[PDB]
Amino acid sequence: DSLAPEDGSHRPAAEPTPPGAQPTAPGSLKAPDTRNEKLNSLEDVRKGSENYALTTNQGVRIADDQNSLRAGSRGPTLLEDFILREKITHFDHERIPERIVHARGSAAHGYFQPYKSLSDITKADFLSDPNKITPVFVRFSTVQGGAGSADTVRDIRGFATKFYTEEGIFDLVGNNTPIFFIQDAHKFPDFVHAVKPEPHWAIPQGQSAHDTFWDYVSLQPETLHNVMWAMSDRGIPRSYRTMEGFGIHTFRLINAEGKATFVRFHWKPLAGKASLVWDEAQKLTGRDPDFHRRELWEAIEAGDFPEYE
Amino acid sequence: DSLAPEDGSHRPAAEPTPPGAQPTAPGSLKAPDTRNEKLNSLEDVRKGSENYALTTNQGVRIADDQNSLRAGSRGPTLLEDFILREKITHFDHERIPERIVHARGSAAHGYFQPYKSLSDITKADFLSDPNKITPVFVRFSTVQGGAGSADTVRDIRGFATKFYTEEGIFDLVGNNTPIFFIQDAHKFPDFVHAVKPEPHWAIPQGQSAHDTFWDYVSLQPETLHNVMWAMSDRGIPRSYRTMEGFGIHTFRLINAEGKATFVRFHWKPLAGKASLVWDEAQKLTGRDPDFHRRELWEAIEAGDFPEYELGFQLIPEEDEFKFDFDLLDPTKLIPEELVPVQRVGKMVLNRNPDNFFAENEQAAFHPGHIVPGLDFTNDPLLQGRLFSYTDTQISRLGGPNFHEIPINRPTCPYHNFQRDGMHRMGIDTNPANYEPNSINDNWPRETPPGPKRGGFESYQERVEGNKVRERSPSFGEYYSHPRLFWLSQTPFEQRHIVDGFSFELSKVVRPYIRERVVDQLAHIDLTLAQAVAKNLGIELTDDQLNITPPPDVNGLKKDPSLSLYAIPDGDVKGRVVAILLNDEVRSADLLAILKALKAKGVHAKLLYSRMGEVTADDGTVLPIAATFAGAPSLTVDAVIVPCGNIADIADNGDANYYLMEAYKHLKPIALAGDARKFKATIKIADQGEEGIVEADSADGSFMDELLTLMAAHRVWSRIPKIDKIPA
Amino acid sequence: DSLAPEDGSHRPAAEPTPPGAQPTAPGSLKAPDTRNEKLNSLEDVRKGSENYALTTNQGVRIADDQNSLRAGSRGPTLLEDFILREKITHFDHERIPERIVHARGSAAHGYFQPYKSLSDITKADFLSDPNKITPVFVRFSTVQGGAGSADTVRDIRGFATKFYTEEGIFDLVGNNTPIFFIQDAHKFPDFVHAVKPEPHWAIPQGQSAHDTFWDYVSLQPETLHNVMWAMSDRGIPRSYRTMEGFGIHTFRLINAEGKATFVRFHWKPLAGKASLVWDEAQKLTGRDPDFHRRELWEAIEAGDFPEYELGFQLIPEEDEFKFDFDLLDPTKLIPEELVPVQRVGKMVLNRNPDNFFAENEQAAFHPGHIVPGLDFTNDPLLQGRLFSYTDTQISRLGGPNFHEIPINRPTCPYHNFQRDGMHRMGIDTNPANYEPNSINDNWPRETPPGPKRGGFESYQERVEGNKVRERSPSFGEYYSHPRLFWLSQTPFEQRHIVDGFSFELSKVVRPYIRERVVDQLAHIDLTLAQAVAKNLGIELTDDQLNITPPPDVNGLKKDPSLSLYAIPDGDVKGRVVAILLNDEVRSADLLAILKALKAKGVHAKLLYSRMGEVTADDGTVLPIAATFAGAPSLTVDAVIVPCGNIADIADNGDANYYLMEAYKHLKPIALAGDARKFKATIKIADQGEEGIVEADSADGSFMDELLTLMAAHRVWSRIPKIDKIPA
Amino acid sequence: ISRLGGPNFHEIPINRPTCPYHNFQRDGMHRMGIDTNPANYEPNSINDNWPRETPPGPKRGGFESYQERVEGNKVRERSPSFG
Ligand code: HEM
Ligand code: HEM
Ligand code: HEM
């Protein structure tokens, strides 16, 4: 007599299945066959659970996890209850600081490969050979809202790719528009404070529709280009799968002879471009604020891998 | 040539003014005259800004705050730019850990005073004299959602009051329901994980409508009582001003002779009880997720101070066992029919903070911050809480010295031998850091316990039993309280409870969980389980249909104190009404509307298809506060549509839907003159209908009918008629 | 009946009193009258203790601070004991990270003033007016050892001064030598790891005498100059009062017209230069490892304020390239023969702190805290430092808000848009947190640069070159500075340097390292390498013997400013003398001894075989400050042994060895009457000897000879005679 | 929590147990372990209540405190027997 249903309908199929079909599940149980060198390198720190005893962090098996140790079935809790202290303590310290910006974000694993060697223009090992598969981790995000804000807000989106290359980690940290708000990083905090909730009362959440943000804009026309994009349907995407991604800055490529070529990076969505409309987007933040995080998760379980070029 | 407008319209009036009237502002600039000893003690750490030079944190004036220092107008940034490094660094480290729970929260300052000395029952100095004013800081909150989640979610609300007393800080850390989910603090993290977003993917935010939460519930029927409240309209309040607050645990009062009296604490809202309905609440999380935080802030700027009355249920020591549930079980309420709530004093929340991070975010409430005159009981959930609220500060607020953070600073003296935290502010001059010590003549000294100004000493409760990890058998009853709750509710309240469960349950993906929760409901009440099971498409079995209901609670068949709306105490002061404008408003209509509302403290917001102005028929200029879409019916208590150029708005999608939504959410609607032609959209008869006020023009009669509908909060009688409207 | 003694001898006098006279005490109780604007600004965070009740951090009075709350006088502790949990918790979290380097350090308050306005060369407000008094806080330190390591180690000393100016905090973060170990900050961690204890086993503490440090040296001859200083008596000072201090890098001064002048900063000790010798220093780390921290503390309580004179080497812009080393190379000194030090002002350190953790431990010095009037140069070690001192605070002092920690707080205004750290004290009222902002009329505002009270603006140095990671070729000279140093030293100073290297090198286990370091020494001076190589048992080869010495430095064959003792400026005020007592001291001897010493500000400590008292021959009662073993000769500058019952101590092992150790460490010794029979132990002749003052009795002549020996600090002429004595 | 920076100090290599350790504790600072359990709570049906409590026994049992009798009042007082 255990608590799982007899017919086994607690446990999802290890199979590509559509949104709604199955309960969702950790990648390593929903898609155990999907691999790559990063995901396999994580094996040493994964922990399973089936057929294991519940224990303290120090290894001790627990016999009753339903009660504090007290003097009598109706007495005080005793300070010698180290099982309770550890369990509460760990809970007590669960949280770590959210990101200053892009605190609200959704990720996945995957891989990249070049279409052709690029050694003409760069010695970047990860671009040296179209047979070279590079594991990636990607986190898409909003910018302004906290880690528990809505997904479909009118904001810029972040689009960050960590490439785990053979000659080091390369981070491509971009947005869903090809420009930024400001020209010099020295005014970074100024702008971010301007769009972040107002300091006296912490309002509004994941919105630019307030006094201070526009005050700033109106006094710094450098912002206007990106503000344009934000106000467009670009700032309310359908899906992380259906937006373009940009490195924004001009960088350099450097080849084996030392020749520099300027470059700007792009991600082009094989899913194409698609965005919501405002009333739909705004009301959807209420009806399902995890809309993007969800859609991404499901699309992946469903075999609809997001691809970008 | 400076950047402020010439006419001075950047700067808000230092005057009580309605929602929308002025830009909002830090309490110390919006209400500089409001004071109390806490707020004045904060003066040493406030910082102004006018007529000061912008500087580095080290005091250096900055000449250019628009640029990094680079080699050339187009070169690299140099590492010697300490101005840029400090400015970015500080920004880089701005954030601190959110609360584990109740991370999403809204606060204010204020005060409390007792109605009469309470020295008969407790030596608590703050309750000793009705002339003794105690400054308070209060933070209301949700439970599950992060610090950036929505306000109007279906969750429990927290209600925490820090009393800055003369013999120490007393923290009253309560919720908006009178029970908790669980019995022993050891399962705290289990339950909280169960309702918090799911670990694999971090979904859903500030919602209980997911698999794991209900899985837990279904396996731990101890939770069912509070789950009932959550599913009721209790779990989606109108305003922090319009909910009740509860200490939950039985505590002790202790007087100058050492007599213990058991007590449970209450906050009773002078604003009365009022709550939204689900569709309204859920969609409002999208339209304005800061709805509660906003409403609180504005109500305060507006002079509508939230007030609550502190009341005690008192139970003598020799009555411990007279009730047929255990006073120490926190999943059981003490019916007010058996123990009534005695009003003891009052709290007024009369000023907003200056900086939300400084004052709200960093405040630390902890229920074990009690004072002489109070003490704990063996409630095994309370017992737990004692441990956790001190611990968690060490990582949330960065160390043991969190009591030195301004808002948390006591306002009485505090001296000891505690030395050296991280971020230590106090500089101890005591030649000694230990006691006994002869080198400073043992100062500071222990203080023997006494009538007033004494040392703390715990009530000397007899403890007899063995060291066991076992739930008290007396806690083994799960259903009679839910049942009591449910039968106290009005019929429309019960529809809501039903629809509450049905909605949540419908987003549990694994259907066997839906069945198991239904099974639990069967043990509480069969009406209820039938209605829910219908909505999930489940047939109760013969077995389930025959399940014996649990006992009355101490012979009670209902308790009217458990209903929100049993005895309406709804109060209009502070509420807001939408006025739908057209380009040609009949001014004497409008005059009379605003004049009537103003007399009863009811705020209006004038709305239109666009911003700016429109002009009255008599050429009074009417400024627009927001558009129809900008400020949806969700955000208001009623809708009024005066006469004029109705043709202007008559075919406007947004104005029509404003009315349709308002109607579906059971709000009062008032239509003057040609505005009555809008009845067509709300599929109302020509005969009239209760809840729709109508007339040739707005007069004495028209306004009074409307305001009276408002004193009823909502038009419940409308419920049967709303399923046909498509909104 | 309280625990303080009836006669009040627990509580020290609020009066300047000598070392040993009184118990030591927090500055604000020992010297309440000493003030300055910093110390008075600290008043808001000081906490007293007398006549206050002992309480929890939340304000609650405690009645019993001797017990946990338990179920029964013999039962378990209960989790509801919040008094115990808070008290233990705070203790549990007392410690914060030690400094990465200079973790071991000692501080005090004080002030500075300029001798004359300096507005000709700099607009630095703090140097604008000789009437302008600037409060300072100074922390002296070692480098390698942990916060609980010894004071008298052979290490570099740090010397950090925080100036609390009217236009911001200026941090002067220097050392006790005029150069550094390395050229580019990129190798900072490499060197520091090399000298810090070895990673496998954490050995040795505050010592450079290990394998890895010398391995590094031997492979990076850039280090050799400063290593020279370290090995000299410079690396084992007598007192923080008796060393020179250096800013090391060339900085810029910038005046009201924008003219840059290069500058290097100096502190010149009004106490003069004085240092221990190795055996004395090393053994003193065992006998009193707090020797420096103590001496500083006492000197201050005693009225012997440490004073230093701030001096500048100034070099005009067009002289950048006149020197045959690079002004930007921090491993090169600017000889005072080529650029003399101009005294500019003076600093007085006139009050100890109240709480060592509060004020010392938490203080944050950072060289990039400069003000208008000052600016940086491209010194590639300095360039580095700029980055690190802001960064490291984030984990040492727990966040970006470390400038809010009391001691670190500026004393001028500071306002900006920086919001929200961990442990945020300031509560910002600015309606705006950004600029430009119109909503607060852009306050606080940028300030254009100007003659005084202006914005900071960097000197607009021309930068021309490509982005490279390459050491300047002009830095490629390693030996001529060491050579200069060495040839400036007196012969006995050079023995010490030799013995320095020989000792350290002898504890390098892998002998090939010993050889490689010797090889380096060969390139500096062959005398030196011969002496060291002898002591390690190494034969220099023919190759090594022929190595050409490096060039003179700009035609210099020596610089007397680089010697400690070239031109003795040793000063007796503040020094201490041991007086060896017997049970029958001849009182008129002693009268004359203490009377003479007192006239020149020289402190005495009366010592005996045990504690308590002894009586004079005339029945004056002589209190004993410590025993012979309790306060070894190490801790004193000279030893005096008056007449009386010499028989009492004549055969006492400890009294004899007191003298033998004192003699081996070249200290002045003075023996009256029968005390002359002690000459026997120190293997002195009957004829006399220079450095041993002797006579029938202590008179005008006897005392003066002694004090004059003291003005010479040590008896160098004794050196040849000490190897025969076995101490 | 402050010396070693968080609740996850048992994950620091030297401190790591050498036997199995599994529970529902989630998320410290510097979390090394990546939990795959579909559930982070118990009772839980969705992972068939794993990992499970273990009743106490001769070897390999759950921990259970010795059931010492406690009798006295809640006092802050040194035992006289210690005097
Ligand atoms: C060029 C325009 C920018 C783009 C495309 C951009 C992109 C982002 C993205 C996508 C994230 C979220 C990273 C994640 O998922 O972990 C992010 C986080 C961050 N960004 Fe921005 N960013 C931009 C400008 C800036 C500027 C000007 C600063 C500061 C000067 C800044 C500092 C940060 C910091 C400190 C974090 C997150 C904390 C962390 O991940 O360690 N970024 N950046
Ligand atoms: C009796 C039922 C409970 C009530 C009425 C309750 C009330 C609350 C409220 C209102 C907050 C938000 C405080 C704020 O605004 O700062 C809160 C936070 C917290 N609670 Fe609960 N709580 C309950 C159960 C528990 C249990 C069982 C634990 C742990 C065993 C717990 C531990 C915490 C911690 C660690 C925090 C916040 C972190 C902090 O403020 O230091 N509480 N409690
Ligand atoms: C120019 C040669 C140097 C001098 C004269 C020097 C001086 C000092 C002194 C005296 C201290 C102790 C400060 C105190 O009492 O709080 C110190 C600490 C420190 N130094 Fe060095 N230093 C030098 C080189 C460096 C370099 C190259 C770095 C890194 C590149 C460095 C980074 C630090 C840090 C991070 C601290 C202490 C942590 C803190 O106070 O915030 N310094 N410096």
Residue numbers in the entry:
A (entry chain A): 27 to 335
B (entry chain A), C (entry chain A): 27 to 753
D (entry chain A): 420 to 502
Paper text:
The post-transcriptional regulator Hfq plays a key role in how bacteria cope with stress as well as in how hosts react to virulent pathogenic bacteria. Hfq helps small non-coding RNAs (sRNAs) base pair with their target mRNAs and regulate gene translation. The structures of all Hfq proteins are characterized by an N-terminal α-helix followed by a bent β-sheet composed of five anti-parallel strands and a flexible C-terminal segment. HPII is one of two catalases in E. coli and is expressed in the stationary phase.
Here, we report a crystal structure of Hfq and catalase HPII,both endogenous proteins of E. coli. We solved the crystal structure at 2.85-Å resolution by molecular replacement with Rwork and Rfree values of 19.9% and 24.1%, respectively. Catalase HPII is tetrameric, as in the crystals of pure catalase, and one Hfq hexameric ring is bound to each corner of the HPII tetramer, one per each individual HPII subunit. The Hfq ring sits on the central core domain of HPII and leans onto a lobe at the C-terminus. Approximately 40 residues at the C-terminus of Hfq were missing in the electron density map. Formation of the complex does not change the conformations of the HPII tetramer nor the Hfq hexamer. Most of interactions are formed between the distal surface of the Hfq hexamer and the conserved core domain of HPII. Between the distal surface of Hfq and HPII, we found that residues for RNA binding make interactions with HPII. Thus, the association of the Hfq hexamer with HPII does not interfere with the measured catalase activity. Given that the proximal and distal surfaces of the Hfq ring bind different types of sRNA sequences, complex formation with HPII would limit its repertoire for binding sRNAs in the cell, and regulate its chaperone function.
